[PDB]
Structures are given as C-alpha cells and as structure tokens.
Ligand binder design. Sequence first.
Ligand SMILES: [Mg+2]
Ligand SMILES: [Zn+2]
Lengths: 103, 202, 262, 37, 67
Amino acid sequence: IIKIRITLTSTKVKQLENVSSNIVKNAEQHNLVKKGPVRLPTKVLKISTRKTPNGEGSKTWETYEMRIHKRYIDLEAPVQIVKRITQITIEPGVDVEVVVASN
Amino acid sequence: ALISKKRKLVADGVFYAELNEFFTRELAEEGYSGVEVRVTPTKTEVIIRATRTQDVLGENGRRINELTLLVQKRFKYAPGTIVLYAERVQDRGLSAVAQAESMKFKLLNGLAIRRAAYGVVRYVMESGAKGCEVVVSGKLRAARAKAMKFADGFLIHSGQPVNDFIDTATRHVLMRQGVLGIKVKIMRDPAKSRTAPSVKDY
Amino acid sequence: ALPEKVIKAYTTVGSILKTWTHGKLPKLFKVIPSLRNWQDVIYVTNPEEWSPHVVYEATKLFVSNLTAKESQKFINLILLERFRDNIETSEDHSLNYHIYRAVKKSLYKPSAFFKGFLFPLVETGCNVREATIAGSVLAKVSVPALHSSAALSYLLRLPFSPPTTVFIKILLDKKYALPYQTVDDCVYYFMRFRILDDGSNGEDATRVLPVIWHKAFLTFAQRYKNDITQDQRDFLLETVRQRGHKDIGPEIRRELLAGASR
Amino acid sequence: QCRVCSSHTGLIRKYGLNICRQCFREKANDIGFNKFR
Amino acid sequence: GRVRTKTVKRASKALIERYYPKLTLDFQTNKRLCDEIATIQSKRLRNKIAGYTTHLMKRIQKGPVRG
RNA sequence: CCAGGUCCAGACACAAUAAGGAUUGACAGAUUGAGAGCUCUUUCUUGAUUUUGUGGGUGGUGGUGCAUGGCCGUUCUUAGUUGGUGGAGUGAUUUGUCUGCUUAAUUGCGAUAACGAACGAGACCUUAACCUACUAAAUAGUGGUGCUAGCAUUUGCUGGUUAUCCACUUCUUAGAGGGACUAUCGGUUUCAAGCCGAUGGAAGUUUGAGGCAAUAACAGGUCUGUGAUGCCCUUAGACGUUCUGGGCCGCACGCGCGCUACACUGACGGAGCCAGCGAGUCUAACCUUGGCCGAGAGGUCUUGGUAAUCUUGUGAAACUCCGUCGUGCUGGGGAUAGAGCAUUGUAAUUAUUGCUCUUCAACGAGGAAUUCCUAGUAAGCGCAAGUCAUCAGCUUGCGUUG
Ligand SMILES: [Mg+2]
Ligand SMILES: [Zn+2]
C-alpha cells in the first residue's frame, strides 16, 4: 500500500493524450483508486530573433515559439504494479516521473 | 545532474541532436537511419538502428567498445554507465542458425526442454522479430517419439514472401538416448526489407 | 576509503590548480611522485579539469621522477584521456600548445609513451586528426633505436588503416639500425597485402592502397634493402609486380634489386 | 564558446548552451526549436 | 480582392455539372452534402467549396449558366 | 593593443668531442630586476637525453593559389516566365504572351494560328479572438456544509481552516467539435469571374500575420576534406607562451540614437492601491518569505521553492484623494563637485554601484530642416527576460492609463 503521484510532461499533445488515456484505462480496469488527469496550463516559450543576420537594411524582428504541456495523475497501487507500469509506459516524447512521498 | 526542467529538456534535446549528428557523420557507410536512447535507473542504453550491423560490431566488439568510449570520453560519463545496443541486421535472435545452435548447446548442457524454449522464444521476440516457431521432434528421454510445436507472434507459411522473409535451420542434436530434430523458424519485420410504386410486406 | 584529511587537502590543491599558468608547483602536488600510492591521490584532485600548464608540468614531473610502468600508468590514465578530450572537444579539432609540449615531453621516456599512449590510441578510435597530431609529435621527439623498432613492430601487426600507415611513416623515417627480426616483421607486414592465388585471401589483398603505402614501401626498400634475404626479396618483388604504383613502383623495384642478401 | 565552428563572436549564453547564433539558426530543429509563430 | 482559388472553383464546377439537384440555397445542408460525397482533406477547403456551391445554387435559380 | 621582463626553437643527415665526462632532473641556498625565471656551490639523481658547426627541407598545431565535391549567407530577392509541338519568315525574329473588357495579378471572360503542359502568383502549414453545450481538476478558482474569530445583534458582514466533507468549471486551463464559406440584401460589372455599401455575425480590408517549394545567378564564407600541386623563407621570427602595469571611457569639436527638464493638467508630504510576460539554486549558494540591528544603503539570524505550490496576489509605476508651494531661473530643473558610510569584485584611482548631507550649472516650448503613426493604436507610465560579478540611459516582451 503506497500512494504514487505520476506526472507527465510532453511537448506533443497527441502522444501525451494517448499515454494518459492508456494510463486511465489501465488503472480503471483492475480496480485501483485514483484521481483524473489534472491539466496544467500550456507553457509558451518565446525567444526573439533578428531578421537581419547581416547589417543591411532596417532592424526588424521575429519570434520563435514552443509549447509545453503538463499533466499529472495520482495513483494508489502496490509496488509490482507501479514497477510494471513504469516499465511499460516509456515512450518517446512523453516524460514519465514517479513520486513516492506525499509531503 | 539536477537540471531545471526546461533546461533539462532542452539539454536533453541537444544530447539527442549531438548523438544524431555524431552517428550521422561517423557510420555513414553502415546504413545509418536513426537512433533511440533509453534511460534506466541503472545505466543509459543507446540503441543503434543502423541497417548494416555486421560492420558495427567487428572482432570481439571492437568498434562497439570504440563508439562506447567515444560516448564516454566526450560526454563526461562514469565508466560503465553507457551501453550501445545493436538492433537491425546482426541481432542474434534474427538468425535461425544461431538460435538452432544455441538451443543445441542448451540441450547439450543439460537444461530443461521447456525452459530453453522459453529462453529462445523470448530472446527472438525481444530482438525485434515479428514471429517465431520452435519445432522439437524426438524421444524426450522416453520410449515414444513426440511431435510438438510452439509458435509465438505472427508468421506466414505460403507464397513468395516466404522466400523473402523467413529463415529456417534444421539441426540434429545428439543426446544420450538418441537423436532429436531441431527446427527453428524466425519471422522478421517486413518493414525492414531494405533491399410504378410497389409496396412489399412481411 | 581514503582518510578525510587527504581528501580535503587534495580537494583544496585541486581547487588551486584550475587556473595555474606560471611559477612553482604546489608542495603537496610535488610529493605525489614520491608516494607509494599515487592513483588514489590524483583521483581526488579531479583529473579532468586540469589547466594545460599543470598538464605539461605534471607530465614533466611524472615522467622525469618515475619508473617506466608508473609513467605508462600515468600517461594511459591521465594524458591519453586528456589528449583525446582536448582534441574532440576542441572547436576546430585542434590541440593546445601546452598539451602539445606535454605529449612531446612524455616521449623522453619512450616505452611508457608507447605502451600507455600510442597503442591504446590505435585500437580505440584513431581517426585522421589524432594520428596526424601524434605522428607530428613522434616526428619531433628523438627516440632510441630499439623503442622505435618495437613500437614499429607493434604497428606492423596491427590491421590496416591509413593512420597506421602514417605511424609507419614516422617510425620508418628515423633511419635507425633495426634488428634483422624487425626487418623480417616489416616483410611479414608487406606479405598480407599481396594476392595469393592458391585460395587464401582477405580484405587487405584486394583493397585500395593509397600513395602513402607505396611511399612506405619506397622508404623500407631504400633503407633496409641490405637486411633481407633473397626469398624475402623475391616475395617483395611479387608484391611489387602485383600492386605496384604508377610513379613510385619502378623506383621501388630498381632499389630492391640493388640490395644484398644477409 | 561555440563548439561547432570556433566562433568567438555572436554567442548566446542562455541555459549553459554557448552556441553562436549562426550555428543555432540551422540546428534549432534538431534540438527541438521549431518555427511556429 | 478575395478571388477564390481555382481548386474550389473547379470542384464546385464539377459538383454542379454532375451533382446538381440535391444541392440547395442552404450552405448548412451543403456542408455535410460535400462531406458525404467529396473527400476533401480540410474543414476550411470544404467550407470554401460548400459556400461556393451555395452561391452557384443562388445564381443558377435565376437562369441558365454556360456550364 | 602597447612599454618592458622571461621561456622554447632544429625535425633529419654529416664531422670533431664525449663514458678517464657532454650533460637531464629533486632540491637547499646565493638569487632577482617590478614578478617568475636564468646561472653556479653543495646534498644528490647523473650516462648520450649528447654540446658546437655546415646542408635540401622536415614542421606544414606555416599560411596564401589551382582542381573537385560539399554545407551556410545573398539575388532575376524568381510572383510571369520557359519549353514542346504547330503556323509565318531564306534569317534575325514572331505568334502562344491579344482588338476589347475585368481583376490585386499574363486572375479571368471573350475573340482568335495557335494548342497542350509545367513551375510563378494564387495555393500548403502555423497562429490568434466566441462558445453558461461537452470532458474535468488540493500544482487553479468559486459556491454550499463543519470548527472558530470579531462586531451589531433582527436575519448579517469580514475572515481563518494545502484536505472537514459535497457540488461545479461561471471565471482559470488541457482538449474534441462547432463556426466563416466574403452568409443575406442593394448598387456596379460583357450585367461572366469579381468590387463596393447596408443587416446579421465572436470574427465579412484576403479577420491579421510569417515559413515552405521549382528555377536560373552569386571569384560569395570555410571544410581545421582530399590530389609528389605554383609562392616565400624553412627556426634565433616569436604568428607560440607567460608576467605585471595601462587603456579602449582621454576631450576646441561635427554627426546620430536616447534620458531628464524648461513647470502649478505641475514639484513636495501623507494616506487608497492594480497588473501581466517571466524567471529562480548539486555535488552549489539562485529567487528569497519571516524575525533583530541600522537614518538609509544594507547587514545579520532562520525558513520556503528545484517550482501554477515559495518569491508572488511580483499590493509595480503613472494614477486617486487630502494638505504644502504661487508664479518669483522658485521649493522647477539636477549638471558638476566634496566629505563620510555600506555592498560586489583578488584588485574600485581615470571616481563600479547604492545611501546621508552639501554644492543647486546651463535651460522660459526650440530655427533651417527632419523621424514615426489610423484603435486598446500614438503617447505617458512602470515591471519582467537577456547581456549579469555590480549598475542601464542598451535591446526584446509584458501590463496600467489611453
Ligand atoms: Mg515552332
Ligand atoms: Zn558556430
């Protein structure tokens, strides 16, 4: 009996949604108590870049952009179930973090 | 270690990009297609998906340990925390002759008839094969011959892709009681093939 | 485990040595060659982030004050790895001058330099730039004849690569008095590239040899024509008549026919 | 400094990355920075 | 000027020379009409084609057109 | 970049010397000028590593040229061009590409010795603004219910409580879809594609923006890539190393980008007090809550956050009110300068920066001329992120008023 908080970070939303739906449909199917996938706001990471690498013309600017999404699902499970889900769920693009303590 | 989260992910992306460019420029003649890395709590595993694998592992793993030390020395890692894995062509679970000789040596060592079959099927299945089939025919330390077969995965049995994809090796292990038939058939990935109005009623 | 007094003292002198450029070495740094156990001491001093000046001065102290096996352990654990790091992490893939002076001075003891530096390098990823740099360093430093002979004899038994051919250049241009068995091993290295029609051939029989190998064949046939037998002379003539060069090959056969048997 | 092309000018020092901008402008997509808006 | 592209014009010309009678003056029916008959890869382009077929149903009901 | 002080040259070949001594190091001292060196007296390792002198050039971590392949930076920055077949002409050439009309467009219609077809542009991608309808939450918020605090009590108000429970996403957010297609009407137009005005709409200038191709041109830049490649010496040159000390800010000045002001829609003193884009520390010391000291600058003692959790509700400034000042280079302005106290830096003088007092310089809306701009836009105002060890008057964003 250990409570495990699993937090998922991903820049792509499709693989993150597939991972979260697989986690929810795997957790509900063998009778574990849990919370839903709590949806943090999407971080938008912006940086400014010159339009002029060379010194010709007037100075004007553009912006490069990123999108980062964060979800976290709280679980309650035994140790072997947590270990086998942590072995299964490793996919490229979605980062899986396992938290033991609740403080 | 212990990098802040956006800096951790951007430096991780630089780590993917630097190994991608290093393996693009290094093994250009060994069919380089892509890489993937797996981060375990024990160590870090590099999976080299290069389509000419027999030139990647040379004599007694010399170029494998060479590329392992190239990852080790430049990227500031402890000795033993990186393992570079070979996948595509010279994976030992994709050749039926190697697995037939392997289960030959496993039966000759004195293992079980079932547990060695579990080991060879799991080693073929974890190596990147679509399917496998194990045929053992013999006495099985008894007075009656038994024919008994186990297929795992998805395999084909007829057609022109039979002549293109499967590999079958026939071996005969010599036991203390008699002889036994060793047939290993391995199915590989076909995506790795590089070369008036009317009314009715009832 | 080490005592914590040694740990904090050598962590302190490791924190000192990051920006050393001139002057005298520290006193606790100059007694490590006098120690019976050097290797635990130098690991606490964080070996990877040394300054180039203490790399060269540690090379000077840890070559001029040690034995041969002690210096080869030093160069293989320290200087070879920092040599590799300072080439592949350099941005034009160059070498620093103090590191160049360190790799130059470490061949004052030649056997330790060979068996700690050169021989792991050729088997663990010797590319063009590393071997060009090391062949230049081996071109500068004057070596005795027998260490050149034995390191050349290791280079002959290596599998073929043009970096190994560059090392074979640098050790065959010394014009030293080799033993006759070293000339025999040079002959045996020059046997594995010819084509055998009896049904025993490898990768080196039909591969493309550049101009560098034929210059090496010219060099060996002009210096050591008088230290071969007639059977080896005929086998080298077979090697000439199989894979001779357009512009070097006639010179090699006319200088090989002008040699006397032993 | 920039460990691609020995660039001692045009560095950006954010996040401990020290690439010059003229090497960042073609290696951004391999790192993960893609042009969106 | 908001001159429509030639793909929308040609697709509407084909769907009105061949699939005249079920198209009408209502764009909202024509949207799922061109969903159920035409395989258009995007919602924007099928909205363009459905609005153009709605407009050609608007002027075809007053008289004949060259097509 | 200088003024000086030091190393380390040279691979290789040849000749004398050298073991009955050429000389490499650990030193302890004499040193040594500014600092390290350098050298010689011992205690010692010594042991060819040679010392000195001649010669093509090794060294190309010696570079410029010639051939290739190659990546990045520009342009005809292709936004109307080319080609196939036809016709016309001995040929250069032309028709396609046009009498007309229309469009933002060589975009179309129509007519026709032109008729096909490609890449241009149109188009593909990516963003925004509305969804009280979904599908859903202690790393967000609201409401109800407990326990509890203070006040009038006649019902109430203001709160606490990172779990006392319940409900929800109305606001916050992750999504699936919708929706817009110039919809409808009226003018205009061969009344053909289109354009303009009105209504509805969250959105009706192409609702607004940039990336992506094919093509012909770049002696553009290097790759520390390769080919007995042309050039100059091969080295007493420091293009290699170090050590200190100075700068790049020095000032009749011209030009340019900005800040602060010339004031009373204001300067000063109290009170009211509103944001968002962010960012933040490991094998180190970032963002800092809270408590003490100090006028302050700040110091000090602890704690939280490796982050929607803590800084932070960034209680920001301009602003709002109530008092002081009266048109007086004034209490506007704050240049310059001195003294002291603190902080960062190894080191603050040519004053790094911050605080206290004093000094209170020009400067009474600016000539010829000139910059930018059509709605949350100009302008004023602060804040955050980069340069960061310390400061911005540098740049990019954000928010407030408008
Ligand atoms: Mg023609
Ligand atoms: Zn660069």
